[PDB]
Amino acid sequence: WFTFVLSFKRVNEPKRELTNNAFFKFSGGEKAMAMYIPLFTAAYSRYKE
Amino acid sequence: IQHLQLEEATTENLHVDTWDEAPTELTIKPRTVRYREKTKPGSFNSNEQK
Amino acid sequence: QTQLFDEKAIQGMDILFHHYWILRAEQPEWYQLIREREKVLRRYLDEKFGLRLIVHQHFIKLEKIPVEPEGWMGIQDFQEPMDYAIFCCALAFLEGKAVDEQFLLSELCQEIQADYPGDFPLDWTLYTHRKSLIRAVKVLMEFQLIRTIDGDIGRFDQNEEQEVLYEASTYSRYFMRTYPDDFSSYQHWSELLKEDWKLNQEDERRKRVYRKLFFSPGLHRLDQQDPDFLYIRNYRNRLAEDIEKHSEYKLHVYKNTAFLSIAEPRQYQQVFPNSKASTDIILQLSKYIHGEPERFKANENGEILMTEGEFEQVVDDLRQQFGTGWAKYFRDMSTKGIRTELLRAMKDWMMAEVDSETSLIRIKSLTGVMTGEYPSDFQTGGTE
Fold this sequence. Notes:
3 chains; A: 49 residues; mainly alpha; B: 50 residues; mainly beta; dna binding protein
């Protein structure tokens, strides 16, 4: 019924949405950060319970 | 049947018209020997320095 | 032990689509390949497309009945209606000949002349009529409906006295599919479609969408509420997954168009872009339209509307910039001729429509998928 939407915001720049096309523009460090920050935060958030 | 040739499923956005989307860029070979046109065997570079 | 859709089945499906039919006597490898998976192919085609796959002792054929007929579909070697009329009359004649019976070209010409149903008689003293007959016979020979006992038909162009000895091959019987009623009761071809889809009431929409995708180069959104496009939007992901699973193609979807792309086209396939020069100008026009978004702002349906004068002005601008690199065929031809040729090409690919009433040009969103340019070094070369 629902869907997930990821968003990235560079400092002092307008918010956006993390599409595949916008993703490819990322650099290697940005790519890794985007891929893994959500997952490890998910692991983290689950433990908050 | 006929179809378009493309190397990758570049787009994923159902909501954007093709004009406003980023197109796929091709290199048209100019049809003058001024640049290049071949039917018989072509040449290679012999790149020994590399 | 059960069959599965695999490399062989995918290859067989492509071979079925891209040819009218496969003959055992000439395509034994393809015939054998198709037959082995024929069970899986029949199942898949019936469930998703609804096409009837005819598997026979001498041939295999997929009755590709289109959702809405389009210009490029027809037999391309023919250029006038008279060619189709002569082709059909020749078939009617072959129904009168037993298998491997031999008849002379003069008999075929005489019978075609007699039966030819137009108000205006068919006459062989003309050049154009003889050329039409030669094209019809060439297409017939292409499908191996008739074999040639030695001779030469090409001379018929410039020598009406030419003679040839032809042989009716077995395939003539099976060439044309079967029709629902006594076919004579129908009055216009449109009535045929209303029948062929009377057999596919079950999930007509899915078969409709699949046929449009696989057959046509593209699928254009009729309006804001086009049911086919709504269907595609609702099931984009599973459609893409299924099509990738079952064939080489990969689906694309846009606000105003949807189509299947192919990454590695084999030899026998037709694709865009290709060698013909008219495509080059199509790509250049696409780029030129991309470059002035405010002037050529597409309407909500994705069409771009231009009158013949405006299109000719655009073509003149293109001849000014990139004309130096066009093929010599177009470089030497006036603007209006280029407009006609380019519009025929774009019609074949369903890129654009010529409005029937106002002569207004509608450039469809499919054109904007691809853009082309000369290498920068030549363009700077064009400056020199």
